[PDB]
Enzyme design. Structure first.
Site, short mmCIF file in Angstrom:
data_model
loop_
_atom_site.label_atom_id
_atom_site.label_comp_id
_atom_site.label_asym_id
_atom_site.label_seq_id
_atom_site.Cartn_x
_atom_site.Cartn_y
_atom_site.Cartn_z
N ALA A 128 5.51 3.20 -10.45
CA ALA A 128 5.89 4.14 -11.50
C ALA A 128 7.23 3.82 -12.16
O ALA A 128 7.38 3.98 -13.37
CB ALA A 128 5.88 5.57 -10.98
N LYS A 149 -8.60 6.77 -0.80
CA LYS A 149 -8.51 6.24 -2.16
C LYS A 149 -9.85 6.36 -2.86
O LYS A 149 -9.91 6.76 -4.01
CB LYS A 149 -8.02 4.79 -2.17
CG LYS A 149 -6.58 4.64 -1.76
CD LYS A 149 -5.62 5.08 -2.88
CE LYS A 149 -4.18 4.89 -2.47
NZ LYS A 149 -3.24 5.33 -3.54
N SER A 206 3.58 -5.07 3.53
CA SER A 206 3.52 -6.51 3.32
C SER A 206 4.94 -7.06 3.20
O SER A 206 5.30 -8.02 3.88
CB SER A 206 2.68 -6.86 2.10
OG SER A 206 1.29 -6.66 2.37
#
Length: 308
Positions: A14, A150, A188
């Site tokens: 964002a 999701k 990650s």
């Protein structure tokens, strides 16, 4: 000359999206939990933020709260695991309902590659595109609560958008890397950090698809600006095995510790999934190669002092 809303304006994607929108002259209403909080402070410093960025205290579970911010907007970018599902879905519903009432032109919803590929019938040998959907049962069977949630959220978004005749488009990013604006970021990057700080002297036998955060932002804007944009949009560059990530870091950062071997040397190297990014390429998106994603990530870990 447009005004747009960005939800959860202080998150990773964002923030980079807000940055992009400010550079292209947009007036921006970023919604956050608490505007006068330090973790949001980097937004107010962006180029154009003084002139064209406002932050708003919004609770997505309170329909009137998002409603008053969405009124007047041409576009809404909604950028925002077992316990988060119901409220996330409720908040998304409120964003979509509020967008219908405000008569915005289009809603862009940030989803995930996790809604695309998680189906037993989906092999690592086929080219996976936007026509593939994850299997709710299979996600549930395997305690893959990320992919389950999701997938539920995105299906809910489509249905609520369809009920309200709202123009909704969706971006489905893979793992997102790149420079930080705030000071946090994913598992990650944390693994990459653990390589480079010497905490991890091995690497696992796994693969992953990566994409530059700037590309993800650019994908969001492209699907908002392009009148003909419709449906889902996979946002990926290319996939790398963990060993391949290590070899890249070794060429760019030879002075740093790295793992010395795979923790699994008895099995063959896992092959990556093949994802198509042709839909975004056709809208004219040119992707930053993964090598450069890893480079920018590490520089940012250095500059921000997460890396000794």
């Amino acid at each position: 000359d447009q005004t747009v809303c960005v939800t959860g304006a202080g998150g990773f994607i964002a923030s980079w999206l807000v940055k992009l929108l400010l550079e292209r002259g947009y007036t921006v209403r970023g919604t956050v939990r608490n505007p006068e909080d330090p973790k949001n402070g980097h937004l107010k410093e962006l180029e154009g933020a003084r002139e064209r960025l406002t932050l708003h205290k919004v609770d997505l579970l309170d329909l009137q709260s998002i409603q008053s911010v969405v009124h007047g907007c041409h576009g809404v970018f909604h950028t925002a695991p077992d316990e988060m599902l119901e409220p996330a879905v409720n908040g998304t519903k409120n964003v979509i309902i509020a967008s219908a009432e405000a008569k915005v032109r289009r809603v862009v919803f940030t989803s995930s590659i996790g809604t695309v590929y998680m189906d037993p019938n989906t092999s690592r040998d086929v080219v996976v595109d936007e026509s593939y959907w994850s299997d709710l049962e299979h996600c549930k069977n395997t305690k893959n609560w990320y992919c389950y949630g999701k997938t539920v959220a995105e299906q809910s978004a489509w249905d609520i958008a369809k009920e309200n005749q709202v123009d909704l488009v969706v971006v489905n990013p893979v793992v997102v890397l790149g420079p930080l604006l705030q000071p946090t970021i994913n598992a990650s990057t944390i693994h990459i950090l653990k390589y480079l700080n010497g905490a991890a002297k091995t690497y696992v036998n796994a693969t992953q698809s990566y994409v530059h955060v700037k590309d993800v932002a650019l994908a969001h804007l492209l699907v908002y600006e392009t009148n003909s944009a419709s449906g889902r949009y996979i946002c990926c560059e290319t996939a790398l095995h963990r060993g391949e990530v290590v070899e890249i870091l070794a060429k760019y950062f030879p002075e740093y510790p790295l793992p010395t071997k795979c923790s699994d040397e008895k099995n063959p190297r896992v092959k990556p999934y093949k994802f198509s990014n042709q839909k975004l390429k056709d809208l004219g998106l040119e992707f930053t190669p993964v090598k450069q994603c890893l480079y920018d990530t590490v520089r940012s870990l250095q500059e921000k002092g997460h890396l000794p």
